[PDB]
C-alpha cells in the first residue's frame, strides 16, 4: 500500500512520482527483509537524488529560469 | 539577593525566583471582572438593551 504525502495531485502518472514509489517500495522491502539491502544498494534503488525543480523567482521572465529582454 | 556572583560571574538564573514572582504579582492590581462570578440567571429582556 502507498500513501501519498506532501503535495497531492489528481494524476501522478509521471516519472518522478514513479521513482518516488520505487524508492518507497525498495525501502519497505529492505526493512522487511535485511539481506535484500545488498542488491538494492548495489543497483542504486535505495540511493536518493537531491535534485529538485528550481524555485520561483519573479525576476525571471517565466519566473524560473529565463531572464527578461535586454536592448 | 545573596548571590554575590551575579551577572559579573556569568550567573543568570534559568527560573525566576519566588521573591521576584511575589514582587511583580503584588505590584499590579487585579481586574474585578476576571472573577466572572455568576449566581442569578441571564437577563433576556433588559441586559441587551441597557443604556445608550
Amino acid at each position: 500500500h502507498i500513501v501519498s504525502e506532501g503535495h497531492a495531485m489528481p494524476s501522478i502518472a509521471n516519472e518522478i512520482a514513479a521513482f518516488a514509489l520505487r524508492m518507497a517500495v525498495a525501502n519497505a522491502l529492505v526493512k522487511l527483509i535485511p539481506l535484500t539491502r545488498i542488491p538494492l544498494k548495489k543497483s542504486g534503488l535505495l540511493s536518493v537524488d537531491r535534485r529538485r525543480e528550481r524555485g520561483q523567482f519573479p525576476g525571471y521572465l517565466d519566473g524560473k529560469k529565463v531572464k527578461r529582454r535586454f536592448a | 539577593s545573596h548571590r554575590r556572583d551575579y551577572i559579573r560571574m556569568g550567573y543568570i538564573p534559568r527560573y525566576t525566583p519566588w521573591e521576584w514572582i511575589a514582587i511583580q504579582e503584588a505590584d499590579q492590581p487585579l481586574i474585578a471582572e476576571q472573577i466572572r462570578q455568576d449566581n442569578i440567571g441571564t437577563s433576556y429582556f433588559f441586559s441587551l438593551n441597557r443604556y445608550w
Binding site: 506532501g6 503535495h7 497531492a8 495531485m9 489528481p10 | -
Partner: protein
C-alpha cells in the same frame, strides 16, 4: 429538468411527519437567515479545488463561491460582508504615523515632564545651529521672513535695534 417543487402537507400525508421545508423555516426563525428566492437550483457547485483532498491546495472549506458575476455592489454581498471597524485597518490608521513618539504620547508634554521645556526636532536644531554658525561670519545672506509681519512693520515705541 424544469419542474415545480411539490409540498405534501403532513396532515394530507397518510402518516404525518416534519417536512424538510418546515424544518428549514424553523431554522431560519432560529438563526436570522436569508432565503434567496431567485437562487437557481442548477447552480449548486462545489469548489473542488478547495473541497477535494486530491489537490495540494485542499482545505476542507468552501473558500470561494463559484459565481463569475459575484461583485461587491449587490446587497447579497453587502449583507454578508465584514465591516472594516476594529480590523487591521483600524490598527494601521492609528499605529502608523510619522512620529511614533507622538503616537505614544505628546512630545510637548513629555518634554515638559522629563526635560525642562519643549525641545525642537533634530531638523529644527540643525537649522538653528547652521544659522548660528553662519551669522557670525557674515550677515548679508540672511533675510527677514516671519508669519506675522505686523509686529516687524509696527515695532513697539521703545524698540531701537542696535546698529552693526
Amino acid at each position: 429538468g424544469v419542474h415545480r417543487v411539490g409540498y405534501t402537507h403532513p396532515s394530507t400525508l397518510p402518516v404525518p411527519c416534519a417536512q424538510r421545508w418546515d424544518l428549514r423555516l424553523a431554522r431560519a426563525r432560529i438563526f436570522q437567515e436569508y432565503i434567496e428566492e431567485k437562487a437557481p437550483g442548477a447552480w449548486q457547485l462545489e469548489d473542488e479545488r478547495s473541497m477535494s483532498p486530491e489537490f495540494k491546495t485542499f482545505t476542507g472549506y468552501p473558500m470561494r463561491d463559484m459565481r463569475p458575476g459575484y461583485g461587491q455592489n449587490l446587497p447579497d454581498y453587502i449583507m454578508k460582508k465584514r465591516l472594516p471597524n476594529n480590523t487591521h485597518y483600524e490598527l494601521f490608521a492609528r499605529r502608523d504615523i510619522p512620529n511614533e513618539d507622538n503616537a505614544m504620547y505628546g512630545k510637548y508634554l513629555y518634554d515638559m515632564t522629563v526635560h525642562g521645556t519643549s525641545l525642537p526636532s533634530t531638523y529644527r536644531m540643525h537649522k538653528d545651529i547652521n544659522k548660528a554658525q553662519r551669522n557670525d561670519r557674515k550677515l548679508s545672506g540672511n533675510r527677514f521672513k516671519v508669519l506675522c509681519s505686523s509686529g516687524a512693520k509696527n515695532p513697539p515705541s521703545g524698540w531701537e535695534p542696535i546698529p552693526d
